[PDB]
């Protein structure tokens, strides 16, 4: 697991930090991904993530969900623009989704991948199904739902071995976060992939708004972030 540990050392030297969090990460005060989140900081440099979660840019922890091209009219023609939708994440507990625009497909992908890192979140995994009652981080620990635009999404826990039975794009997002088994129920128009993608993202975020007692944890297996890499 080393090829992405010399990347961290190379970036951590020629990077001049400009915000407070960058100063902290460079001075060795902050040294783990799990302690930049629940504090109300702000993340404006993408190099806070290339140093603390280096394998986020591994080309198999990246994904391009869709590419569109859109237009605005003028008395001298049609001014064209792109729209890429990208997601990144290590397949342990951390995911991000961003969009990014440009005049060419290459610049747009770069901005998509860049903004995906700054909009990152951590989630909870477990096993809450009636059929499989193991205690292993392979699914969603309970029913959660999220929404965006006109799309409503619900995710339900499923037993170990069943695939990810959700739509065509939900698999990428749910698989970059570390899940492997789920069920699903959808309303609204699922053919606008931006709103469908943002609904699944919102559900995975809502995973951590449900109040739970300390006894439920050693019944569903709830882990937050990495679970023994």
């Amino acid at each position: 697991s080393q090829e992405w540990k010399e990347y961290a050392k190379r970036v951590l030297d020629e990077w001049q930090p400009k915000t407070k969090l960058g100063m902290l990460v460079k001075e060795g005060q902050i040294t783990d991904i799990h302690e930049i989140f629940r504090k109300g900081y702000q993340i404006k440099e993408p190099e806070i993530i290339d140093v603390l979660l280096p394998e986020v840019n591994a080309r198999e922890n990246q994904e391009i969900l869709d590419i569109a091209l859109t237009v605005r009219m003028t008395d001298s023609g049609r001014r064209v623009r792109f729209r890429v939708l990208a997601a990144v994440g290590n397949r342990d507990g951390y995911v991000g989704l961003g969009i990014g625009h440009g005049r060419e497909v290459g610049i747009a992908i770069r901005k998509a991948i860049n903004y995906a890192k700054l909009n990152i979140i951590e989630i909870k995994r477990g096993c809450g199904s009636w059929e499989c009652r193991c205690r292993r981080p392979h699914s969603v620990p309970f029913t959660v739902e999220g929404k965006e635009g006109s799309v409503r999404v619900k995710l339900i826990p499923g037993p170990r071995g069943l695939g990810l039975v959700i739509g065509d794009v939900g698999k990428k997002i749910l698989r970059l976060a570390g899940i492997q088994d789920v069920w699903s129920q959808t309303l609204g128009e699922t053919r606008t992939t931006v709103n469908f993608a943002k609904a699944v993202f919102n559900a995975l975020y809502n995973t951590n708004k449900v109040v739970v007692t300390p006894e439920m944890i050693e019944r569903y297996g709830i882990v937050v972030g990495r679970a023994m890499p």
């Binding site: 059929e131 193991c134 037993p159 170990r160 071995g161």
Partner: protein, 175 residues
């Protein structure tokens, strides 16, 4: 109403042209040298029925549901697919390449009785192997555990003589 119809014992895919699945099945067919696809979906179904049984005896409780629970372990390990210490929750982490390892073809090849995998098919179909003092001529037969050691060449086969010109090319690989 209507009387009984005989039904198919396999299932086709929901969509026929998914790329990431044609790519996954094109490998299992060259590694075990199965004849067509309907020969592959039959084993997937043999596994999915076990899985769907363990999901119901896992939520259920009662007197006879108990009896149905420990008949699934008993056979499922009489068939060599589980060990002698396994609890019910180990039915859910079984794989397709565990059932494809129990065909008579793959076993008569993994015991050194054939030089390759497409030759074991011919040895089974032309009637040279024997399973427990009994010629069997069907390569898809799942071998049990109490008899995966009593497998040889037929007593009346040309291969049952360590001077045959074709048997001498077989042991020439075992070192």
């Amino acid at each position: 109403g209507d009387p009984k119809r005989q039904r198919k014992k396999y299932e086709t895919p929901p969509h026929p042209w998914i790329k990431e699945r044609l790519d996954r099945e094109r490998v299992l067919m060259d590694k075990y040298e199965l004849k067509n696809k309907k020969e592959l979906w039959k084993h997937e179904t043999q596994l999915k029925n076990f899985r769907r049984r363990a999901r119901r005896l896992l939520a259920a409780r009662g007197k006879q549901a108990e009896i149905e629970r420990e008949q699934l372990l008993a056979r499922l390990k009489r068939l060599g697919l589980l060990p002698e210490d396994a609890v019910l929750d180990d039915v859910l982490s079984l794989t397709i390449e565990d059932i494809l390892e129990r065909r008579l073809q793959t076993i008569v090849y993994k015991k050194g009785l054939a030089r390759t995998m497409r030759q074991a098919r011919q040895l089974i179909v032309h009637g040279h192997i024997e399973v427990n003092g009994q010629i069997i001529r069907s390569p898809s037969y799942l071998v049990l555990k109490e008899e995966e050691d009593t497998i040889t060449y037929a007593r009346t086969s040309p291969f049952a003589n360590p001077q045959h010109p074709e048997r001498m090319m077989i042991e020439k690989a075992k070192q």
